[PDB]
Amino acid sequence: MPYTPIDIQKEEADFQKEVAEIKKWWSEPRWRKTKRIYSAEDIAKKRGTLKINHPSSQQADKLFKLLEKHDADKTVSFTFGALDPIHVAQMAKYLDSIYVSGWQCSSTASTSNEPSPDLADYPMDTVPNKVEHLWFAQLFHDRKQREERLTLSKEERAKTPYIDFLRPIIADADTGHGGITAIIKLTKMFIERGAAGIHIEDQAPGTKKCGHMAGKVLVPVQEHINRLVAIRASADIFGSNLLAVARTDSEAATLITSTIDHRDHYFIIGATNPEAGDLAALMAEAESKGIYGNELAAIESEWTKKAGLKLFHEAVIDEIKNGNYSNKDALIKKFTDKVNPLSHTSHKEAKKLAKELTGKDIYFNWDVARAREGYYRYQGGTQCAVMRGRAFAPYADLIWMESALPDYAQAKEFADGVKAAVPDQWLAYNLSPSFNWNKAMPADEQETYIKRLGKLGYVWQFITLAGLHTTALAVDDFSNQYSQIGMKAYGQTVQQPEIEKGVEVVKHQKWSGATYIDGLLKMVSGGVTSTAAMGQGVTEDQFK
Amino acid sequence: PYTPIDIQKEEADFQKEVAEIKKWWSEPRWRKTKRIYSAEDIAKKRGTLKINHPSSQQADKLFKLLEKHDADKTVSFTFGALDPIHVAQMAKYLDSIYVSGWQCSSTASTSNEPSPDLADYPMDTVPNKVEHLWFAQLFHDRKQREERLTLSKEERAKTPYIDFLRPIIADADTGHGGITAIIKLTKMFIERGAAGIHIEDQAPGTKKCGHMAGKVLVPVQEHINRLVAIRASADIFGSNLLAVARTDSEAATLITSTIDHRDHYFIIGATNPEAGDLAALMAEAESKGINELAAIESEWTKKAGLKLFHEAVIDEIKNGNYSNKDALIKKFTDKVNPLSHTSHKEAKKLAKELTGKDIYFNWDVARAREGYYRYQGGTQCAVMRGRAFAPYADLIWMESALPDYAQAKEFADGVKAAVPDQWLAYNLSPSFNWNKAMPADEQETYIKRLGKLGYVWQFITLAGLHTTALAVDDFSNQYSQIGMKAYGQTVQQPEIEKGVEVVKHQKWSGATYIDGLLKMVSGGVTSTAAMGQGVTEDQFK
Amino acid sequence: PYTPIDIQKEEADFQKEVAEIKKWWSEPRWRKTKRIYSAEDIAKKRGTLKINHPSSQQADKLFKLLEKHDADKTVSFTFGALDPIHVAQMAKYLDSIYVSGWQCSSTASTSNEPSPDLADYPMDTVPNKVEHLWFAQLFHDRKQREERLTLSKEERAKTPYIDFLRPIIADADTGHGGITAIIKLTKMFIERGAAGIHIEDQAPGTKKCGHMAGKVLVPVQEHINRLVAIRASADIFGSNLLAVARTDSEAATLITSTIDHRDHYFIIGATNPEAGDLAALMAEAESKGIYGNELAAIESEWTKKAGLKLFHEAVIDEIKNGNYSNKDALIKKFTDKVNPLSHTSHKEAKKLAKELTGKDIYFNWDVARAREGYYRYQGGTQCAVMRGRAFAPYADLIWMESALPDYAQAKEFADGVKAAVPDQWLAYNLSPSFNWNKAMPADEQETYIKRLGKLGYVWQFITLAGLHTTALAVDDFSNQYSQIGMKAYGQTVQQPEIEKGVEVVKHQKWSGATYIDGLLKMVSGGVTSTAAMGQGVTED
Ligand SMILES: [Mg+2]
Ligand SMILES: [Mg+2]
Ligand SMILES: [Mg+2]
Predict the structure, then answer these.
(1) What percent helix, strand, coil does chain C show, rounded to 5?
(2) Is the distance from CB of C530 to CB of B206 less than 8 angstroms?
(3) Could you cite one Gene Ontology molecular function of this protein (chain C) (predicted)?
(4) Which of A43, A169, A195, A210 is the catalytic position?
(5) How remote is the C-alpha of A289 from its chain's centroid?
(6) Residue of chain A whose Cα is closest to the Cα of B55
(7) Pick from C177, C259, C279: which is nearest to A374 by CB?
(8) Which of A90, A291, B221, C84 lies 20 to 30 Å (CA to CA) from residue A541?
């Protein structure tokens, strides 16, 4: 009684069966460029006795094929950040994918209902819940529309247009909201709640900024790789072709949590002056004696000038330039050809070479330049981002570099840089409203900007905050009119325009799925019911 | 501006699906399942994207499990689980699992606001509770599979197996509103791991526990429509979800309408023409600022001579100028009785033929102030409603005020006479005092005995509540008296001796499972391993 | 169209509020509470609309309750509650209530996805669990007041009173992210009925249970800032919320940064110049597809060669095996200046070692780093005292996780902390992660709490007791149930419930049926046909 018996032979057989099924799965064309560091054995062991098929995975497939065709045609899947079921329902007419924004979720959709700026400090399940919000709306309107169609004749169907409500969703996972085990659980939720793809950034959690905020802290290249692996591990266990997007904030970031990773060393800023002591501790000693405010910032600005902060290669070049060396231009090139952004040369190794080339132990101390929190100083730009792009590419179906402006040149630099080493890598671009767009570009360029980036291989592009702003404009404008001119504002500003532009929602009972539900009502009540919602009396005969 | 489609492929796929549904419905699972809509009707309700809810597999597992029990005339017996701990330990011993609405009211409302069993928590409360347990089952299944498959074949065969994935049957109360509500409620239950749900012929605004008083019923048809609506939902979203129909008509004394002919036999009315509207009489007395009021009711009731119409017909004949009286009752009783579905107009017509009176009967006047009609159910009323629900319901269930074998037999026999292959379910309620109601020898065999009558699923609704309540109160008492000795003595030693898996709680909670995931992702090795050297569970070896 | 405002009244109200806060902060409750911001700073953070969270009253109740316990040298002892049933029965016997993160991981995640104690459920999980219990407490308090006040004065005095409203102390783990996270987490805890919350100096998303292994610490200052952030939140939203500081430094072996001078003593490094970067050596071996236990072989080899120790161990070692006179006396020059509590930075300690020996004694803690980048760390009880003292200004209770229930160690830590902060309340985990019949005999068990009470551990809790009592009870009954049917329920549960006076066996009354019938009749003008506890109910 007290337990359940099992056939031990059938157990092994089923295990082996599954291992093979996974191996076959992984051999599909979808995974052609997808590096996995674990075995199918490793994954099968993690699964349970009961297989579950998450429909989100079908939208992953739909997304991958959709992006394949776009890459082949050198054209773009362009979308923006959806707020709510209304957005996805109207978007589906025009666009072929859908972005769920963490920024927008912070302000409008936290599960504690407590809003914030884009700090990813809402509870973990916030964006996953937002996807389900939209997912389930998509599914509902798809269900509504199918009934509307199939209660028409074949003759009538062919007249009435079709909306594909089921546009694949790509959702913000921020920095993964904690460790590896967190990221697995976060991914699990995203899969369960209808995510076609999720993106994830090489920032430290709980210093997490928007892409165009300041004071961004990075994590070691490997640490963020492990994040991407962890997503994949989760998707492999629970059986989704979930797309993974890797984001780097290293264009603009000035800080990093550790020096542990050799790839980062080139970019870690340090002091060239032996006399400079620990800035962190110097500030602490000045603060404890009640120096505060702008007189304290004086001591920093003094220490920084004295410390001579730079990247180690700048320091090597500086030694050679101002030094007793015969053939200087040629001697920098010996160093720069071996040691550069992409070259992955550790610091020990780069010092060793500098010694060979100059005969000095050139002094360099990046411990002393640390911030009070302990972060190391860091000088990324586009080339740093390429370095990290390349590193992530094996693990990531799309690659994405946050930029401070909508600069074509920079976008090309990054695209070219990445594709040189991984030419088949899909890229993604933030079309951010954090840019002033009429200040940055004339309108002729605006019109073609997406297309142009499409050529460089940015197959997925999104305006992160467009849903926020369209809504914000619309509601403010109407509220203003409403306050001035009463119900005329509604006739004039909203409802007439809705009719003229063919917007489906103005017939809002039908749109909301009333005739769909009347179907379910009659069906259950044996064909007929006295409480029919769209029967004689409904006030939508005023819209015919 | 839109998306184009092949209109021909549309129709083709539609037709494909209609056929798939027809084939589905023809499976042995649906052998007794009446459907009042077509496969066409259902396919039209579905979307373009098929979704497979794993809950449905647990429905299958539950059905087969109950099939075998019915065939062997034995019982799947379980009780009301509170939380992941319960299901994890229950899975060792029991083969199904009950999620109680009563318990959810007190312990698991989604607003966190507790209550007595009134089903006035938010609708998603029990569906969320199932997912609570569902996901725990799935997790511990996942944990255990890793533990096993990292052992050798030699070692596996030594270590026992737990089937964590016991099918869940969950309280849907009265469906928490109209038909559209019930569809949406069922959808959630399917999505969140329900193998089966049960649903009761009470009115929603007034929903009681089964062993509370003042229970209001709904018309037979109305509750049938509820069951149909569940089935409609399960059909659309593609689950073999089991439906359980409950009737509270054993004890209930009120009903919302007289509209349904089947109910008429049981609707109580006044035999005295002189009695006026009780409701309005009370209202007039209250508005003049009148226990003295309850006096006016108790007077009106005696004067009104309340009874069932057949009692009134029998009474007329008995105390009447009629020659062959016993034989004249039987003419009426054979045609008009609990199971006979005879409307009131029809029963009056016959009474006129048999006596020559329009025997006076007014059930409007006996109405409660809220408007409910008065109602006298018992076990035979419940059989009537059982039979009515049976076509629409995989299990049938009659709430009882006591654990009475005779009554249980009466109801089982009564239902099976008309539907002999109908599975039955029985509440083994802690609302009964069980040592007062029978001796312990009978207690031991009570489930088995009901199994013979065909009660294939039985549950103690509130057992999880009470075991926990005892355990925590007892330990808290000890704890307060003799400190940490209470824990060594009352809990942790017993845990070791009884082999309870949770005392090694790091392992039980799935730490070694997650360390697996951690190492796997970190390329085989990691410095932050949770069950590495240092963990204090080497004190349990 | 905007709204106008009196600019003068604005300033006046601002100033009014600043003063109200200053007065608040001067109350006896904050006598030991260091604040690094002004009342100005806080008032600016508040809105125009004052909100009073009832949780704060339970904070007061908790503080006074602990005051009296400290004065009497006795203990508020409790354990980890699962659900409304627990708090309702606990309230009879105990005077505070613990909400466990460990238990929440397994039983109460808001995604419904369970786990081991990794604090990787969503942030709102424990806050939601407090509200679960909070609202139950409030409900049963409300039920009981109606029951009492519908009795006569004569009858009231016969029927016993339960204080359902026992203050709740809840697990905040490591705060679930940065400072802004911790503010938001604290806000929720206040809104949802937390009397106090506790918080640990581990790194987030490596977060372990206290008695799991591979624990990573954060710099002393970083965890101080966490405690400040709690206080900042409680100050803004106006709770006397108690803050508990936990340190996992007894057992922890890793730390995220070396930035904080206080930590330096405890940071482990390599004494062998020849040892190169372990991290990078592992990375090169991994990228060639060495994995698993053969990789851990390369580590175990490198570690032996590297000669890992604390810098002072290295200084002592140099002097001991060295050409020095007066060796014993020369260690003491160093140890008296440089030790666990002495806060001596590494540069400073090397400088002294040079003065005392004339070597730059080699020490490299960068090379011993784990692959994730963590530095190696050797805490014990003295490290924990160091951190206790550091946290004490910011924390109403102090708490050191221990691997065993060892009296000596508990005394060491209590004495150590109170030496520098003698009025500091302490808290102790009475963990079921210990085997308790293996660790001590039963005579000692009975008195163990009391004895720790003397040392000043005013709040003690069994973290996982709710889990285990329930686990035993359900497993045992399920077993019986399966063996002897309904007899098991009569015998194992319901009879015992009657005999032990447990209130819940009359479960309709307990659940508040007669309370709600009250509300029903009241609204229906005195009378109703659908009364839940009328004639017919089976509780007669
Ligand atoms: Mg965002
Ligand atoms: Mg119930
Ligand atoms: Mg905890």
Answers:
(1) 50, 10, 40
(2) yes
(3) isocitrate lyase activity
(4) A210
(5) 45
(6) A52
(7) C259
(8) A90
